[PDB]
Structure formats: structure tokens, C-alpha cells
Subunit: 255 residues, 4 copies
Amino acid sequence: GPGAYISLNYHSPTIGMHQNLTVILPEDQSFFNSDTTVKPLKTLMLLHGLSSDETTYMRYTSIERYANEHKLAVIMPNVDHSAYANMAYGHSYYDYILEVYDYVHQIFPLSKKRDDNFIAGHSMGGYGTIKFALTQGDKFAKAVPLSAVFEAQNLMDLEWNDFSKEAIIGNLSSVKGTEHDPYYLLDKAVAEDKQIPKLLIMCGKQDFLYQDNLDFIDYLSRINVPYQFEDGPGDHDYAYWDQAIKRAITWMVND
Amino acid sequence: GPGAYISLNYHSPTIGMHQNLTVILPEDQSFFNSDTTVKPLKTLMLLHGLSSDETTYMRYTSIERYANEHKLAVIMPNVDHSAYANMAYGHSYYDYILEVYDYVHQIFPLSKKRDDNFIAGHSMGGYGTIKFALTQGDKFAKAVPLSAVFEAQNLMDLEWNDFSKEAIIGNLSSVKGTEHDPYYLLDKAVAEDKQIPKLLIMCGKQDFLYQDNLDFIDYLSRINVPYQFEDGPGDHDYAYWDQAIKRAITWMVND
Amino acid sequence: GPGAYISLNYHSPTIGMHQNLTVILPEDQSFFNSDTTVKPLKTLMLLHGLSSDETTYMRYTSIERYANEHKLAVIMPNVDHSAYANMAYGHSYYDYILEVYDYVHQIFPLSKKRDDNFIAGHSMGGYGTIKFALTQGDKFAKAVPLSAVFEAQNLMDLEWNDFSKEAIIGNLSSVKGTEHDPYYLLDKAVAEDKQIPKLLIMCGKQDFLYQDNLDFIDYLSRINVPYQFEDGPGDHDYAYWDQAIKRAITWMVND
Amino acid sequence: GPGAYISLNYHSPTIGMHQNLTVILPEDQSFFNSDTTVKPLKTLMLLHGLSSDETTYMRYTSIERYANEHKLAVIMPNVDHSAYANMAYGHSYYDYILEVYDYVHQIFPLSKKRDDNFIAGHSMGGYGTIKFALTQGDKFAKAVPLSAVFEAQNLMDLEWNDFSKEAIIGNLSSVKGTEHDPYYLLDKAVAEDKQIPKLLIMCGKQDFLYQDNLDFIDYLSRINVPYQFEDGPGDHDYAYWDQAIKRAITWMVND
Ligand SMILES: *C(=O)N1CCCC[C@@H]1c1ccccc1
Ligand SMILES: *C(=O)N1CCCC[C@@H]1c1ccccc1
Ligand SMILES: *C(=O)N1CCCC[C@@H]1c1ccccc1
Ligand SMILES: *C(=O)N1CCCC[C@@H]1c1ccccc1
């Protein structure tokens, strides 16, 4: 059965502007009967990579088809070039993800239980995914970084088209040991006894970020944090993220 | 204060196809606070005229600015050339409006109280408005036909671009005494002692439907059904419907 | 290779209403250099099946990614339940496709050469594809029906959700030998020595329309009209059409 | 009469990401006749204020209705909190407006003649308008700042929600005498004998920026640059910009 594709534009109090957001809302019989209470849906926060935006998962994948198969609501915000940080010179986009989460859970029929909420994303969005997994573990039961950047000191110094490192991190000499460093966040999560979401980490074998992914899961192993790592043929493109997100969605909802 | 402009497309079980719908959802503080019970908004079902669709109130008026000012949610469906009827040869568009009503009240924080729900529309949508007011009086406390057609035979017999009367009414030589006839609907509603929503009827003095509007309120007068009628300069265009929907929205939300 | 995803809503003189249309416009370097002449793009008219609309190819396939890879503009109109006919009781939707063709070729940088123009669609849209291929053979060098209905008496008698046979064909007892019949259109095209676009016909072997497809290509063979027929595992769904439109796009832009 | 409302999302080589853009394209009989030469439309570049985006003129005004009346195409980009600058730490948003201009004039039937091209915008967009007027005078015959900031040091030190002064201007303490200072851009344009577009400057008399506007036009008078200034009741809101843009469009298209 099909569902709703929703484009929302609202003025965000956190980032001080109108901003577009897309939502996939699978249909439920209770949505068409006024006398019943809506059945709240499992919900996936889905984070785009660098140069993508709120439309690009819809356009370059079949995610809505996959989400419909599994009665999974999907939230796709736009965070520009922010790497999901509260920027030194820019917008508070880390806070924005938390606002979007609260907003769509207030207005749409989405379950608020931790077991029903997941987060995922690719490249910059996998980096975002792991940051939220390690700082908001109470909000998500599972997190799926796809082709993620785990060594951030390779992302800040990437000279991508119109990308500004300083807008994110200011005049910081190095991200190592800071809240921009997934390894620091991971050590801090373990040290503070925070719940870590269940981890499915995916990366194509031909991706430049592959060795970076191997390094991170090696570290997870050495600090006895469980994870599932899935590799196979694939590069750093939406042809890969199309197939990976289909697999990730099956894994999220089936526990 | 601002709010959310929302474009939705879902596969409707009533009309058997994907269909676009737009929704204005003004901001409430509870929408951004996870620990607050969402406070349901007053809701207007707003019906386009012939040749218009779910986008044209946004485009040709400032309706979102007026609705935000009064924290009024606005639902703008698309019903094509159907005159809001379950068509003889076409779609079940009367049933569709009821589906849309139920659907948005389930998936959005919209009040289900009769006193909080209103309906309005212009030309063919004023005709639609009076039909739902006289057959669904339980669902709406107030109804605002703008530049409406009350004598339905004029709309059926109209020579308009690509418009099909038979699509709506099939073989019927006249609409009088049928569910397509607002005068019969009004007689039936008075005969069955149904609730009739409070009526604000508006039409510009230069509108070609102005005499048709005079005829209807004369009849309302004659059978002692209460209403308010507002005329003044104006023609059958969105310049007038912009000004009229602004007045109409203020009227709905204030008791 | 990225491109533009475009939603257009304009008032159609042919069907007498505002209507949504979507357009994929792959990027060309001449689009960003004002000193260069626009190089017009090859263009595909892509027709949805019954219950789909202008949004559902973007939503349920990765078509924009395939089209970008091959610099192919894609035009995706909405024709409701019309089976791409000028309906007996409804809209002039056959003429509408011709207006859309003219409109987008006037306002966008699209090649007007027959060799650069293709048409394709699935189910009801495969039926529409073969109808336009056999009546507008001068406008398209290639045509691709996917999982199409060739024996039109089956679409007409289908008891699909809210679908109206009479809206399309009126009180015709049978479509055989009329303009609604692809076999009549095919006999007529051959007898009048019209150009028949190169045909690539695709259908999954588990599709209940498979035999219908086998019957039509058998007839093509018996009257010496060339075609390419590709079958294989696949059912009547967007998982199949996603795969098939990717292969169809590659076939149409190469020679 | 009618026209097309267009939403475009393309990956911009200038700002290195997908970005949404809105276009109003009034209808012309040449757009529907494959046999006639497209007559290019007069074109307005319309710039939003701080916290608005590419949707908010459509939502909060009836601009499409006014543009249609005058066969004026309208281009409405999104530039976030950039103040139309190539940001010190952020995106190349000044260059982005030049890209948008070139792109839409390549892919749409828009006049490339200076006399047919205009620019306008409110608050931060009136600031943008005067910056482009004084630096790209060959692109625009007419410019209309609405409720503009002309003394930029106040927009920079405004502590609007989530707004970053340093993102735009870097470590700079003052904007005076830089590319961010309309008075310096004005002095330069005069000293270099550049074409200055015809200026229509509008501001409500209850606006915070009224005095700032009086200061600017006083300086224009003292350096023999012509302008028309229109004030009258009005504050700093879309109620004013709706009425003002309606009059601005009339003034633009009439010679
Ligand atoms: C992540 O979003 N990545 C997108 C494009 C490919 C590489 C880029 C990245 C590379 C190296 C380090 C960090 C990010
Ligand atoms: C209203 O929506 N109708 C469509 C075209 C313009 C007014 C028209 C109408 C006129 C007279 C009688 C019935 C309908
Ligand atoms: C195609 O668009 N048609 C709509 C629903 C599924 C296939 C269906 C069709 C089936 C059989 C005969 C004709 C049409
Ligand atoms: C204009 O776009 N600016 C954004 C917020 C409100 C008005 C504001 C501004 C006011 C005064 C001086 C500079 C900027």
C-alpha cells in the first residue's frame, strides 16, 4: 500500500528562517477513521550528505517505496554544509535536528518510544548519524551510518565546492578530542555509561572512505561495543546508497 | 506569527489515485515542546472554484498570512471539474472531501470539535460549501460560500472550457429535487431538523452570480433560516476572493 | 551529472484547469554560460499508470539518476483515470499530452527533432504510449510500452477503485475497431504508411498482462512491423518499472 | 490572466549544493503554438529578506496574480542568512545570484535585453537589490529596494535569531568603505561612470528603516543620481510588501 509524500516549509525558531523538510508517511487504516486513535508509526531520521538536501533521497533513490513496504515514516531535513554542527559562524544545525525531531513527533502520528525511532545517513550524514547516536542515544534505538566519515579531520580539510571548514569549527587547530570527533564522543559515551544505539555500518568496498570505516569498527571492537558491518561492491554514490538504504530499512524495522 | 506550508500527495482509497493536497498549519508553542500536549487548532476546509486546484489559493491570495494571524489551519484539496459530487461518470469526490477531513484530523493536530471546524470556498467551491453545510452540518459550525452558485442548473449548463455536465450528473435533464440542488438540500435539512452551520454568504456587487446570491438569501429569509450576507464592490476574481477570505477568516475564529 | 527537478503548475487551455506536471532537466554546461547557445536536450514523454500521477515516477523509482546519467530530459504529466483519451464525459486528455509536448518544447531547451524525442509509460501509460506512437508517429523516433495493455477491452472492463469506463468511452459496447483499440490504430498506421517509432516493449513474466503482451508482439510479427521485446522475471509493480525504465533510457539515447 | 508556478531544485556549481528556486512564468500564446517564435518575457529578480526563503513571496503576497497581469516573469532564489554576499565563512551567494540570472535566462523564454530585466527585494533583499544595482548595472534597467537597509552596519549588528555577522564579513569590525557598504558602492559607481538602473525606492513611514531610507535618498540627491521615492503608511511586514510589490511591478513594466 502507498502512503503520503509530504513537503513542509516552516519558520524554524532554532535556525531563524524558513526551511524545507520532507516527510514520508506510510498509510495506516487508522488514518482514515475519525473515531479511532492514530496508530503511531516507527520513525527514521534520515540525514543527507554534503551537497545533497531534503529532496535528494527522494530523487536519487526509491526510499519511499522501501519505507512503504515496512510502515516506516522517514524524516529528511536540510542542513546545508553544516556537518550537523552548531556552527561557529552559521546556524545551530545540531539543535535544528533536535527541533525537527520534536516538531514532527508533535504534529504527525509518530511513535515517541526509543525502540521505534532510528537515525541514518550517508557521508556527512553518516558522520551526523554517528554524532547523534553518541550524544542522543536515549532518542534512537538504532543508527545506520552509510559511507560515513569517522575521522573528521579528513572532512574539515576536504576542499569541497564552496565548503567552509571555519564556518563549522571556527579557528580550531584540530578536531581531535572535541565534540566534532566521533572517537572522542564514543569514548565519552562509554565513560558516561550512555546507551549506544544498535549499530549497522555500511560502506562500499570501493569507497575512498572504506579504510576510514575499517579503522572505526576496529576501534569499536577494541572497546567491546557491538556492531554489524556490511561491505560489498559499491562506491560513493547514490547507486550504492539506494541499495544500502533498502537493506538498512529492513534491518531497522525487523528486530 | 508564522507557520508551516505543507504540500501532501497520498494515494486516496476513495478516489483510487494519488492526489495532491495543501495544508496551512500555523505555529503553536506546543508543536516545539516534546513534554507538552499538542493543542489542537481550529480548522477550515477551503474549496476551490472551477479551473482552480489545491495550489491556487496560496498563489493568488495572501491566505497563509491571514490564517497565521488567527492560528487557523486551512485544508485545500483538489476536486478537478467535479462540482464536489460523487460523479455519475468520474470520481467519488463528495466522499473524497469527507476522507480528506478525516485524514488531516488524524495526522495533524487539528481539533475535532464541531465549534472548531469551518468550511468555505468560491464559485464551484461556494456551491460545494453549501452542499456540505446542508448535508454534513454535524461536522462544521460555520460555512462561508463566496461568489457561490446556488441554482445548480446554471453550473451544469455552463459552457466552460472542457467542462462536462454529464460527468457529474449523468442523464439528468434537471438537477431540481436531487442531491445536486442546494434548494432541495436546504428544504431537506430544515425538514429533518438538522444543524445548519452559521452562514456568512459573500458576493461582489459586480459578480455575474450576484442575482443568484440575492435569490438564495431571499429564500433563506422566506423560510426563516438565519444568515449574514456581505456584499460591496467586487467581481468574480481572486482580487475579490483575497479580500473576502481575509474577512471570512476573522469572522470564523471570533465568537 | 546532476540536474534540475522541476514541478510546474499551469492553467491548461486544453483541459480548462490548473494541473501539475513534473520535469527532469539534466544539467548542461551551456545552461550556465550566457556566451554559449543552449544545446537542446533529448526528451522523453513518460506516462503514468492507473492510480499514479505526475509525482510517482520520482517517488518510486530512481529515474532522475538514470536520466541525468544520459542527459535525457523527462516530462511527466498527470492524466488521472483518463487512459490518455479525449474522454466522452471528462477531459480532453489526448489533446492534453500534445499540448504538454508543445508547451515544454517552447519554454525549455528541448530538442524538437523527431530523432531526439521519445515516449514511454507503464500499464495505462503503456497503452497511452502505443496510442501516441501509432497516431503521432512523426513526433517520436522511439516508443517504449512497459507492462502495457494492448487489448483495450481489458482496461475498460477493469473494476479498479473508483474507475469509470463510461467516462472514457461513453456508451460504447466494445472498443474493438475504434480509436481506443491499439490493433485498429496499428492496422490504420500500416495502411496509411505512417512512420512507426522504434518499439521496445517490456513486460515481466509474472505480470498478468504478459500474455496480452505476447499476443500483441505476435500480431506485430505477423504484419511485418519490427520491434524489440524484453521480458524476464518481474511483476506488475514499481520494483519492475524502476529496473525497466533504467534499461529503456539506455536503449533510447544510444543507437 | 494565468501562468505557471514553478519550483526548481538544481545542484548549483557556484554554491556546491542542491538549492530550491521559485519561478513565476506568465502564459503567452507563443508558448502553446509549436509554429510560432517564443516572445521572451520581461523578467524580475526578486530577493527575500532575512529569515524568508524562495517560497515566502508566493505565500505571504499575491505576487503571482500581479505578475500575471503584467506578463512579468519573476525569479525568487534562496540565499539564507547571507545578505547576498560572497561570505567570508559560508557560501558564494553574490556569485550565486549571477548564476541564477544566467541559468534561468538560458533555460526559460526570458528576455536578455537590459531594458527587459529588473531587480527588487525587501529588507535584506532591498540591500541585495542596491548592491547588485550598483555592481551589475548592465544587467538591470530598473531596481526597486523595498524597506531596504542602506547603512549596512545595522543589519550586521542586528542580533536576529541565529544570524551570524562573522559568517558574512569575517573578522571585520566595520563594513564602512567595503563591498558590503552601499554608500561606498554608490560612490564607486559614480566615480567609474557606470550605468545605474532606474531606482524606485519604497518604504513605509512606520518602518524602523524609514530614517535610514531618507538618509540614502538625500545622498542620491546630493550626487545627482535620479530616483523615485514612495512612502506612505506601512510597517516592516508582508502586508506592506504585498501592496508595494504590486505597485513596483506596474512601475517596472511601464516605460
Ligand atoms: C562525505 O560527505 N564525502 C562526500 C564526498 C566524498 C568524500 C567526502 C569526504 C571525504 C573525505 C573525508 C570526509 C568527507
Ligand atoms: C464558478 O466556479 N464557475 C466556474 C467559472 C466562472 C463562474 C462559474 C459559474 C458561473 C455561472 C453559474 C455557475 C458557475
Ligand atoms: C494499468 O495501469 N492498469 C491499472 C492497474 C493494474 C494493471 C491495470 C490493467 C490490468 C488489466 C487490464 C487492463 C489494465
Ligand atoms: C531585514 O531583512 N532585516 C531582517 C529582520 C527584520 C528587519 C531587519 C533589519 C532591520 C533594521 C536594520 C537592519 C536589518
